[PDB]
Amino acid sequence: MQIGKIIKVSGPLVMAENMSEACIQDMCLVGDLGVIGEIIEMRQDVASIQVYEETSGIGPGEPVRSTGEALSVELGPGIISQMFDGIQRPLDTFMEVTQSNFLGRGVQLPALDHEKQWWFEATIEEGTEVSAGDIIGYVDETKIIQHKIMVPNGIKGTVQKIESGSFTIDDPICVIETEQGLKELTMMQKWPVRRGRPIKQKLNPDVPMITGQRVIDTFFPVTKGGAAAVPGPFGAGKTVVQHQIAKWSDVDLVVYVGCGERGNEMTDVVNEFPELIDPNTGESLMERTVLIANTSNMPVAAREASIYTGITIAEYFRDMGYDVAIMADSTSRWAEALREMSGRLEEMPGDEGYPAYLGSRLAEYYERSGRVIALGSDQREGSITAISAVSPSGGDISEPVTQNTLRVVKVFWGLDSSLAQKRHFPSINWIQSYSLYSTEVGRYMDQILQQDWSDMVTEGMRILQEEEQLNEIVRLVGIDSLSDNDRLTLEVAKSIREDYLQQNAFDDVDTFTSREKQFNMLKVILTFGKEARKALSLGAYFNEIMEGTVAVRERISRSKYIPEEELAKISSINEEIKETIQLI
Amino acid sequence: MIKEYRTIKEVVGPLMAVEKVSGVKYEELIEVRMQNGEIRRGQVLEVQEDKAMVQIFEGTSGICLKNSSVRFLGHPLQLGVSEDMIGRVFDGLGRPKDNGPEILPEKYLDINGEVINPIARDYPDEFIQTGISAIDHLNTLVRGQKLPVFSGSGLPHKELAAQIARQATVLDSSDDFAVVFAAIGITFEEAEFFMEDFRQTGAIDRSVMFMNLANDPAIERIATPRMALTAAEYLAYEKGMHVLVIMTDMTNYAEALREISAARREVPGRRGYPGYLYTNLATLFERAGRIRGLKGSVTQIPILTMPEDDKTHPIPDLTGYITEGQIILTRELYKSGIQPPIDVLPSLSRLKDKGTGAGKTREDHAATMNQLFAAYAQGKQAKELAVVLGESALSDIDKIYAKFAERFENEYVNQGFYTNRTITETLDLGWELLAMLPRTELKRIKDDLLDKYL
Amino acid sequence: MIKEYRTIKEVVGPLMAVEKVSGVKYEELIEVRMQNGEIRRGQVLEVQEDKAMVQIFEGTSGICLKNSSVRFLGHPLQLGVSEDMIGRVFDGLGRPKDNGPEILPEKYLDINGEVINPIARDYPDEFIQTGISAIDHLNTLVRGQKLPVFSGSGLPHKELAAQIARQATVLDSSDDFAVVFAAIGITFEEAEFFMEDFRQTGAIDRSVMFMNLANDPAIERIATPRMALTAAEYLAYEKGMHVLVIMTDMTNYAEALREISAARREVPGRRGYPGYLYTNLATLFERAGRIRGLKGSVTQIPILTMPEDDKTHPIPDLTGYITEGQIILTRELYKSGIQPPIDVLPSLSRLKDKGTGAGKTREDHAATMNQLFAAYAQGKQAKELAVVLGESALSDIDKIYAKFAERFENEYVNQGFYTNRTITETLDLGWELLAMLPRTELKRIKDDLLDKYL
């Protein structure tokens, strides 16, 4: 076989000659160590290679062997509850094999365990004609998640032989009689990460995800198969928001991608998730989660690979008929990696140094997410919800990565430093943030709750918007110059922010809020407003109302800590509000 | 005839270099046969001696250099035009997307088209009633005009464009606009909005779609508009149809144009965009109007999202230098629940004068427009004064204009995305707003009109 | 086999070119022997074929291309480690500068170190009683945490640095911190201040110091943090010590990085700083933490001066994006004679969750942490408008907040540069620092600790 030879080493960019048979996007082993690299450019016999490992100590003369295949992932039983590299390498197995607490290089490791035995339960009869996407059986990878064995893309024929039993992911378990001849199947399939897995068609994401976060699910909701961006300054709460979503969302599987961030943050996830148990089912968080970690001091090029590895794995379970949520923290480091290779390739900027194709790369990523119809005769439904964090410099969201993201996504959670400085968490700016799903979510919520919830969200938002306008007047003239109605509006606005919007993620109860609890909580806050509005019209002053409602408003301020199994203690406030104010 | 070359020299991103060729012409369409049998097309960017530089629409991903050939078809990129295009949906390169039959083309037309002789041009005179007061009255659209919408990310430019194509009509006999839609790097949901709207109104049966989405190649976005405009001019000047062209997003077109110029390592202009950005967009937007002795027309309504909501950005700025006015949406009005959120102060129509007046619309059209505009500008200045300073600082005449601008936005501009106002209803509504102002301050309306109307 | 090439092809500014080489690797360390006996260190930036582009630390001034020798060492920039580094003072490249017995290093280690496997990492949760209540309560430090101090020129961050070094230690443990100090690109008199302080307190007898001066080569200023961290990870992960690393000034490090970047003709990013500033700084701050099954730890406290007191500047901004919190020093507080001038509002700690309630104080003062945050916020908003304008909105609900600030910055936050207080004392003073606010004002979940002490 043809063996190339390095002629140029410059950072993560390596060029090698004697590779005329090499192809674009193909993978190749670079140098003596055999580090992992991908060909991105090629001029005659010499190919430009993007290395996803450290290239220090490597020079010209060393061999380069092309694998003949693109950057791919191993998809099969044993992929869930695993923490992978940027290029899908088991960090736990890496620690065991290399016998080191540090990350070396040039060490090849399969993504899955090809020795472990799995029980394959056949669910299709012989003599049945199948194509791409069709289920031939499943594996109980976890007690909840069934790993459905699907026919790979490009396979088309009749099922000749199939039988249930204990196999590995290498052993043939099914025989397909095709036109080209006979093809035997396994429980594992490989797929290129830069190519999105085929679907029948895309669908409209109209079903709201229950994130458990009140500010999100109420005012700026994201749907199953939707995309949300979280731009903000450092320490605003970007990583915390994605953590809360990855642990509370009503989603089948969670793919968390640690892209160029802190190592302790991935350590915190892989340690606590196995300890967080779902009382209804009993499974831990880690049994529905796949981890991909490439920290900031890990190879920069592998930041890009960590993104494509994560989204492809998400697509794989999406095709099974599962709802999947993928977190990207942070996507700014991805763009930085593109900028790094851009300068190495002697390319042309670009905004702020980024490559000119940055917008295309981003747009192609989010378009791979969404609610779709997976391939197969049954036309099963799958979806990928993309939650991405963006890290602007100085919080300035007019930089390329944020702008190019906001043009393809419909949800925008803009974090604010002044809110974080007031310990107002989450730090979402209710004035500037938005969700273009709010209208469709509104009629969904009205339909499933059988309440005028959409009107409630609009009214609560109007008060917040009217607050800002009133806050302009209090800056020029004293607060004591306002009417009782405006003084009331400010107090209701205070209740919206402090009792509903403010939500500590480190509190046992306040960390999550069910849809039913969100309704009762918002209704109570809005009930006080309407009843106090009636009192003013019936002669009562503003001060007299406030002084005689200290106790009931105190129940309101603590209604966020009310246990989920006793939500009736929240709705009883509505009665107390009417009774106490009527006494005034 | 022509032959295929196995002399590919290098593959660098969207660019390919071929050596040892002959008879290769500038902007010639090529085909790339890969080793797996897959076919990709492209056009020549530069040719010299035995070499040729081409751009590849679908990209160069997965291409093996040694076992791939390149065909030179001996002609530029063309479109098979037919009247059977109507009711069909095509992709970015003009190929069927609706799983229908292959169109039997009447002819093949170079998608760059040709420039209309200024003498042969017929000046756009015919007032188009879009039903939107902020347009029909203040920024009047005329048949054959290029009137774009300047929007931003998150703003309802889709709803606005859909409303126009659904309500646009001349006051004469013809009530038939043929809609040529060109999707450029837009998302699936944005694409589905137009699809569902065209399907429910039945406009899908009399429209032509050229769809290039966000998952589609970016370089295809350069050919997509020319594909649509060639179809537009064909149905208009050879079939006599009144064509309405909707294009979005125009910003995505410039980004693709910037990718090629960056890959070719050209000398950038302002903010990295090519020096020929103005001229390149001009070859698109100038493709509109009427022709003497010919019925039918081409009316363009391009859509672009202003980066960082900045009008001074090269993409909206150079567009304004090309197009005949612009309809601008702002976030301040969208947050105020104004539908459509049109800010008329930076808005413009360069063909409104000779499209309105007596005989077309009504005699008071020009006067009411200038008076409403000036008063609105004065009121907005008064509201800003009420923001930085107190309400007490405002004079009695300041509060009146400030309240005028407030009701002007709430009742006049804000009409709804599904409400169709007639031109008479608009002009009558204009007088009811001017009634809020003192008669002495109406210094843009002569006594003749001032006595006749309220 | 010792390698040395005696023919230099090309010298363009600070860059060099050596031909006819083989076996030369990327980032390889080299030495150039001048004709006057001088030896200069260099670094291989890039290698093509039989050529190697290298950069010399001390510059290429006075270098001949025929009468010089370039020795390729066959290894990157290293550090000589040993048991006898404690009590010694080193260079920016690890060379002795205290004129004591030169040490024979056990081995040489790559100053780039290696990336800790995130699975092998041990999350920091052991509380460090720095003594400073502004830190200990509200922005709590933990062993293994990277917590920097953001200051400005003229502010006492050097006094705060020495203070923390003096009095910081772990509770209920015999563990004593081994301090690795790294001076980066500072003047002689600045460096002499630390040398003097470490000797008087006797801190030198338990420390390793890497002194890099301002007129030292820019590459050496860049190498200094990696030299110190390699020594830190050595003493921790091989000797089992709990190492406290202190670096200053990081602003100088960034400026040196910017100079080197321009010399290599790299296109500047935001505000003229390199595109890899985030990545580069991340290869330093991520070196902190703990490891499973290994005794010892690495704690970092970076120090930097914010240019023009601007926090949005690339240097403190990208630092804030990497590190686990930040300690802010403002002139407004320092003008009030406050030492340390710590502003708790822009300050933060990301690892204060497991540090609190475990080492201290079972929610005794872990709980009030979010109150003093939220109460001082309104206490500042009140004090802002009540000072410039008249009577506050309330003397019980709005001016009561003003009472809880002035003294709780002159006392609660004051402390002292050579003054040390225990955490118990801090939680003691803290309950007394609420002076004076009634039980109506403390809106916390508990009524228990409101009764135990005043």
Ligand SMILES: Nc1ncnc2c1ncn2[C@@H]1O[C@H](COP(=O)(O)OP(=O)(O)O)[C@@H](O)[C@H]1O
């Ligand atoms: N929802 C929340 N509840 C409580 N504290 C929060 C919340 N979000 C952020 N914080 C606090 O703010 C800090 C910033 O967290 P992080 O998400 O890491 O910031 P970013 O990701 O924006 O850099 C954390 O240390 C945490 O203590």
Ligand SMILES: [Mg+2]
């Ligand atoms: Mg973070």
